[PDB]
Amino acid sequence: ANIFCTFDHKLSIADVGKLTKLVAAVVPIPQRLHLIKHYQLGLHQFVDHTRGYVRLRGLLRNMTLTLMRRVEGNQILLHVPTHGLLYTVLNTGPVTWEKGDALCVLPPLFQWELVPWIVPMPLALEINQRLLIMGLFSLDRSYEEVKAAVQQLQTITFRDATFTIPDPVIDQHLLIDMKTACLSMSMVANLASELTMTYVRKLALEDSSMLLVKCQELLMRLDRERSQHVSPDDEIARLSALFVMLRQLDDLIREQVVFTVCDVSPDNKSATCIFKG
Amino acid sequence: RVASGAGLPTSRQTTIMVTKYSEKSPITIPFELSAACLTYLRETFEGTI
């Protein structure tokens, strides 16, 4: 495949030298179209005050990923990678990679601009769940020990990485997509915790194995360390709401493996990698 | 670029341009000359020895 992007504006030669320094990096693309404007290039079409992080991670799933091949003075050769063959990427993220790292793709948080971080999979996962529990704490921040937990929650320890992840709550207000994400997690936890007691009875009238017995034992330990004849349509609404608000969490519970990396250039500015995507 | 890696292609254009700015500096000197001697030359006197 081949992607051609252009510029209707005018391009300074110092900006040309700035652009060819980004010789092989990843640029997201909304649709694999042969000719494209540069207003579809990068993530500057989705930045605002209100979306933040979960909208960006949910939006970069259904977008495709390219790699820049060469730079001419008025058009950039973007080359969509294919599965199986290996490629050459550049480390634009503050993380430095090692051999064998499965690389993940993530929006960078910390009249037009071009901006995405390429983080290895465990660091991406741990900052994902760190931002998640930092959004869970975000309503009751008037106390001090939860504020110390938030301050411990900001900084992550990694090889040459002292990062200050930004505060998801701002002006005592959480953004609405993080609000729906943490609400979905709280409701799937609650709905699980009160429907497994009914459905372990509503399933063990069939052939019962010992897993059902230990399941009910675990549930009675839960119910005693914490503290049935339902209408059919309310029950249907419970189960369907459980599964549909679970369905909007697939972006957060998985990790799309994108690159499998190989031998690395010195100073960790570029790395040869396979596109497993 | 040395190509001694089978697993590593460099994949660089290798024609980076650099921008170097100049600085001007004028160099002057005052240069005097007696004009009474200048009349002896620009008028080509042919009088005597």
CSV table of N, CA and C in Angstrom, one decimal, chain A residues 13 20-21 23 86 88 263 265 272, chain B residues 7-13 16-17:
chain,number,residue,atom,x,y,z
A,13,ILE,N,11.9,25.8,5.2
A,13,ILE,CA,13.0,24.8,5.0
A,13,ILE,C,13.6,24.3,6.3
A,20,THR,N,12.1,15.9,8.3
A,20,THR,CA,12.9,14.8,7.9
A,20,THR,C,13.6,14.1,9.1
A,21,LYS,N,13.8,14.8,10.2
A,21,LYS,CA,14.2,14.1,11.4
A,21,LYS,C,13.2,13.1,12.0
A,23,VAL,N,11.8,10.8,10.3
A,23,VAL,CA,11.9,10.0,9.1
A,23,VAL,C,11.0,8.8,9.1
A,86,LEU,N,9.3,-7.2,8.7
A,86,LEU,CA,9.8,-6.4,9.7
A,86,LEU,C,10.1,-5.0,9.1
A,88,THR,N,11.4,-0.6,10.4
A,88,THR,CA,12.3,0.3,11.2
A,88,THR,C,11.4,1.4,11.8
A,263,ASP,N,16.8,-6.4,17.5
A,263,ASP,CA,18.1,-5.7,17.8
A,263,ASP,C,17.9,-4.1,17.6
A,265,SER,N,19.3,-0.1,17.7
A,265,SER,CA,20.4,0.9,17.4
A,265,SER,C,21.0,1.4,18.7
A,272,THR,N,14.7,-1.9,15.0
A,272,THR,CA,14.2,-2.8,14.0
A,272,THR,C,13.1,-3.7,14.7
B,7,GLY,N,20.7,-7.7,10.4
B,7,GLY,CA,19.4,-7.5,11.1
B,7,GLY,C,19.0,-6.1,11.2
B,8,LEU,N,20.0,-5.2,11.1
B,8,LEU,CA,19.7,-3.8,11.2
B,8,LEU,C,20.0,-3.1,9.8
B,9,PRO,N,18.9,-2.7,9.1
B,9,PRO,CA,19.1,-1.7,8.1
B,9,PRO,C,19.0,-0.3,8.7
B,10,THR,N,19.8,0.6,8.2
B,10,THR,CA,19.9,2.0,8.7
B,10,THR,C,18.7,2.8,8.3
B,11,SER,N,18.4,2.7,7.0
B,11,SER,CA,17.2,3.3,6.3
B,11,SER,C,17.2,4.8,6.5
B,12,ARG,N,18.4,5.5,6.2
B,12,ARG,CA,18.5,6.9,6.4
B,12,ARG,C,18.8,7.6,5.0
B,13,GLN,N,18.3,8.8,4.8
B,13,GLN,CA,18.5,9.5,3.6
B,13,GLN,C,19.9,10.1,3.5
B,16,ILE,N,21.5,15.3,5.2
B,16,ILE,CA,21.0,16.4,6.1
B,16,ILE,C,21.7,17.7,5.7
B,17,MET,N,20.9,18.8,5.7
B,17,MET,CA,21.4,20.1,5.4
B,17,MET,C,21.6,20.8,6.8
